[PDB]
Design a protein around this ligand. Structure first.
Ligand SMILES: C[S@@+](CC[C@H](N)C(=O)[O-])C[C@H]1O[C@@H](n2cnc3c(N)ncnc32)[C@H](O)[C@@H]1O
Ligand SMILES: [Cl-]
Ligand SMILES: [Zn+2]
Ligand SMILES: [Zn+2]
Lengths: 299, 115
């Protein structure tokens, strides 16, 4: 019905990001409703498809031999639907690694099983996707404070292992959020909170940071920004829609061939920071991709 | 000399009225693809559905070794095209059918080499 029902989802408008709201409870109008999925399509396939459809509109850096890591890729079904959508979306030959606490079968090039804090990589990454979520986090009886857990790992992983010019998409909800992650969005050339039209009845969103700069371009109070996000969701009902799932002719991520360079910190200048902000440069080593998971040994 | 044979066990389980393996990951696509059996991206035509390969492999789903030296999997990391009439049991279809080495279509479901 509404004009955005034909879009893959809705991004948080800029004016809501500039407010100073206090944190309120999230009360969605269309809460409890569900979108009508195409026959036989899982919710997570539809959700990831609309996420990738929206990422197609941004200035993602897409180099040759791209490296993507996907946290929280397992489901209670033992398979990885989000990884399958990512592998369809990403160019052929893209190295895709996924991980989850519980065992699962996936189409990724390599899979690590265990808590994300046990995951270590020698190389940097061009794109980080996280669907990590703890269902015990939704507790409406207690105060809604900033959460640690895997969010503490994700913040450190981005600052250490995300290449300059890379991007992220981290799943959050009303209660599953972290103030430092919002603050880290100010280290990208651009950021938003994206709600898929297929899951618009949920407080879930994907925090998207576009083109990592490795330095704060803008100072963001994480506690205030999450309150701004909830205020947007509370006052902007989003109509559930699966319309964008029916047109996949333009789905694959475009082969841009973004240049990869290995640079020292001092070499970064405004001209290169401009190339990073436009998605026309990735800064990282081009060595081999090596990963590992720490194993605690006990009786 | 002993080796577990899950392929025959799944065929017998299906013949005795067992419910097929579920939660195979079906993909969204244009359904205007080449129609080949196993591809790097979804290639279903109007008569097919495209699935994530690993979710349609009996040996992947059952957490058992693949029946060949090196233990290599044909489907993991790729996408398998299943005829829509058989999309209710993708694991059974990939088990029972074979891909033509010439054209890449399912033998009996697209391959027209011996016609
Ligand atoms: C909402 S499910 C994601 C499902 C999957 N992405 C899909 O496409 O269906 C969230 C996943 O994050 C995982 N998870 C939660 N906490 C984690 C942690 N601390 N470390 C690693 N994985 C975690 C859970 O195992 C769960 O499978
Ligand atoms: Cl702020
Ligand atoms: Zn397999
Ligand atoms: Zn043939």
């Amino acid at each position: 019905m509404s004009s955005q029902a034909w879009q893959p989802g809705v991004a948080m408008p800029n004016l809501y990001k500039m407010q100073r709201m206090l944190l309120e409870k999230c009360d969605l109008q269309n809460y409890g409703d569900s979108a009508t999925l195409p026959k036989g399509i899982m919710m997570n396939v539809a959700k990831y498809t609309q996420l990738c459809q929206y990422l197609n509109t941004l200035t993602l850096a897409v180099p040759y031999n791209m490296r993507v890591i996907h946290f929280g890729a397992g489901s209670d079904k033992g398979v990885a639907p989000g990884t399958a959508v990512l592998r369809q979306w990403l160019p052929t030959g893209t190295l895709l690694v996924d991980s989850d606490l519980n065992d699962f079968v996936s189409d990724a090039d390599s899979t690590l099983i265990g808590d994300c804090a046990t995951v270590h990589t020698a190389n940097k990454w061009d794109l980080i996707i996280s669907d990590m979520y703890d269902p015990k986090t939704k507790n409406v009886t207690k105060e809604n404070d900033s959460k640690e857990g895997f969010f503490t790992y994700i913040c450190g992983f981005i600052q250490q292992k995300l290449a300059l010019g890379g991007s992220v998409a981290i799943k959050i909800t009303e209660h599953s959020w972290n103030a430092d992650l919002y603050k880290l969005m100010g280290h990208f050339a651009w950021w938003t909170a994206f709600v898929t039209n297929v899951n618009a009845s949920s407080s879930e969103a994907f925090l998207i940071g576009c083109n990592y700069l490795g330095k704060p371009r803008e100072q963001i109070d994480g506690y205030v920004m999450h309150a701004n996000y909830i205020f947007w969701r509370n006052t902007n009902p989003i109509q559930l829609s699966s319309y964008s799932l029916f047109d996949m002719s333009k789905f694959p991520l475009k082969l841009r061939g973004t240049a990869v360079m290995s640079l020292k910190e001092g070499q970064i200048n405004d001209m290169i920071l401009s190339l990073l902000s436009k998605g026309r440069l990735i800064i990282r080593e081009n060595n081999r991709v090596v990963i590992s998971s720490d194993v605690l040994v006990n009786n | 000399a002993f080796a577990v044979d899950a392929a025959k066990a799944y065929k017998d389980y299906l013949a005795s009225g067992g419910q097929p393996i579920t939660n195979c990951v079906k993909m969204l696509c244009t359904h205007t693809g080449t129609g080949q059996a196993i591809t790097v991206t979804p290639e279903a035509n109007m008569d097919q559905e495209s699935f994530g390969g690993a979710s349609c492999c009996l040996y992947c789903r059952c957490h058992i070794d693949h029946p060949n030296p090196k233990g290599f999997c044909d489907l993991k990391g790729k996408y398998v095209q299943i005829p829509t009439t058989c999309a209710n049991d993708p694991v059974g279809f990939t088990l029972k059918n074979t891909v033509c080495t010439v054209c890449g279509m399912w033998k009996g479901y697209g391959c027209s080499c011996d016609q």
